[PDB]
Amino acid sequence: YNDGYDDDNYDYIVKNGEKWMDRYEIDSLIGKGSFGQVVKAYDRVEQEWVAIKIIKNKKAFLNQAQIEVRLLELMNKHDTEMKYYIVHLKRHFMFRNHLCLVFEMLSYNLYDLLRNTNFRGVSLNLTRKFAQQMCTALLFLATPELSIIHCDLKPENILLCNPKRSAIKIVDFGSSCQLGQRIYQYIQSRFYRSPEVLLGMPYDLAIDMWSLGCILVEMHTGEPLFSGANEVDQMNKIVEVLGIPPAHILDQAPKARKFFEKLPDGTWNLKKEYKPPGTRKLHNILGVETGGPGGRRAGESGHTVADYLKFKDLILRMLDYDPKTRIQPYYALQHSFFKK
Template identity: 45%
Template sequence: MMVDGPSAKHAQRTSGFRRVRDQRDLRPNVNPQPAGRRIDSDGNFLSPLRQLTTNLVDTYHICNPQFRYESTHNPRRVLTKPSKPVHNDGYDNEDYDYILYVNDWLGTEEGHKYLILDVLGQGTFGQVVKCQNMKTHEVVAVKVVKNKPAYFNQSMMEVTILELLNNQCDPNDEHHILRLHDSFIHRNHLCLVFELLSSNLYELIKQNQFQGLSTQLVKVFAAQLLDALTVLKEARLIHCDLKPENILLKSLSSPQIKVIDFGSACHERQTVYTYIQSRFYRSPEVLLGNPYTAAIDMWSLGCIVVELFLGLPLFPGTSEYNQITRIVDMLGMPPQYMLELGKQTNQFFDSYADMYGNKKYRLKSIEQYSREHNTQEQPGKQYFKHNTLPDIINNAPIHPYKSSSSRASSHEVDKEMANRASFIDFCMGLLNLNPLERWTPQQARGHPFITGEKWTGPWKVRPI
């Protein structure tokens, strides 16, 4: 055997290497643990690094048996922006928002106290923070309302409505309506304590790359929303701001949902506000300035279920004029009585006499509307290749995740197209321009798309 030569000499000079003869030479060398080193609850020896980091609290306790860790002693990270004290003896910022810190607390010594953990969201009404009930240790969401009379009064109405819904209309928490746990005043701010929920449906659409959900999953969500809206309808309440952001999953592991944010809700006899509903989900009667009823929530529901299926909003108006233009382009003109009653009709439509002397209306051109309102209206972006709702839904791609295999079989395609035919009919009942003919939640719940009955053709609504 040759032992001389450059490679052999190099091997002899290289320290730290040894010849591998069999598997025994591949076994690791495990150094014995130094004497006196602590072990954790799993029986593993702790390195000095771990004793001074992840196990620091135990290390302190060994050094001082009197030591007890309290999260309230942690540094307080500010959660509110801007955070400069301006109003309310320095407790509020310039926007009258309460300046919130991590590990600060909300509540009173006599009542419930809530330890602030993190911020969940911010809006015109105020802020929502994740908190822990210091008595029960339950983690909740707390809405901290701005220190302004208008927001305070509106939020007190929200408390009244939720107490009615939770205690009388849905005492067993069966109808997908947000639960209010507590309410109190903290340094002039009304605070509402809610159950903690998960992501909203807009975030779900976004996580799915705006490709839309299956008809089956849309049906599951629609059935729950109709259940909630039935309870509201029977209580003669209107949500007034139904949209994907106000529908939350209970958890990421289940399609169970809850309707939230009753801050704009009202009783059918108290429809005093005219500027309601988020624009994409705003009903024709509200756009035209007509009196409105709970039917406006059903219009919003129609917009939501189509958006869940397509992944994109059906009427993404850039202004009220653009909104009504999109609706008219897809669904046609509103009924004559709505145009004649509407306080805002003349903003968007011109009236003229036809050849028989009858009064008619036509939508103003973009140039005319811009000139009259001193704006620069732009044609809205077109998200869809087709113009009618049936064509848009039928031509949406059948994604692999909408069928059981990577390529849908002809049987699955036929089944999907039958589901879509039923879905189109369901949506058209919700998106009826005439609120007097638009389906109520009780009627819509009987549609084959919701019940799962075989689709045989246009559904005749049953009077309620």
């Protein structure tokens, strides 16, 4: 396979120390995904550290990464401070039959950060700083020329710039598309998958805002909001918190009958373990009146009942079952939660 440079997964077998095109020194493997791998490398020409995404030596992953290159170059074309919430692609090249995208070096992802909290979550103040950046990021992607749906927003795809600051960036546009399809695919990671994608419905940019509401509650509490074992468990866990989706959604939904039954009077309820619908109030999950999650924020600065109420309000508007009325990034940024 590829003069011994590839394993039987079509991945490039990475050697620490290796020098490339008399330009890059491969330090180490910092990432793995469906696409291939990510390595830390030193650019002797630009006197800087970089991340090199080495794509699998297989036509489909190469074509996917060519779409990622296209979308990343489209975003870098834009003359706005908001494009600094997306990881910067410096250049790309074919090397030993692998497409290699060269990115700015970033730090830990938001899941690493939750692990350093021992899954007890970060302060409401640091949550707000991440939420602000993520809404500006979604505002930038919803720019009509771009109209980019990320489709795989999760803690693992949101990285810190550096370990000292609260600045973050979104990576991995390999699952992304531009609006102009109105088709269904099995997409998003299950814990962050929107009700419309579960229901087999067509999707737009609103699915990334669903993912963001789930991510933000997790960043504060330490745990996934909706940690489903499967799509049925996933919908069931969403319905525990948010209740039954509106009938006007379920009436259009190709997979409605996988999760719900339509009753004689035309109302919908869950199919034949779990708490009754709307029993697991976000009010209680966040500990609004009880010192936050597991009461660990009891008399802490910036964790007042009214702070939790503003947060709860933002998230419930991000977790709207209706993609039409789910809050859009601009209005999320005007929310009283960010008037600090």
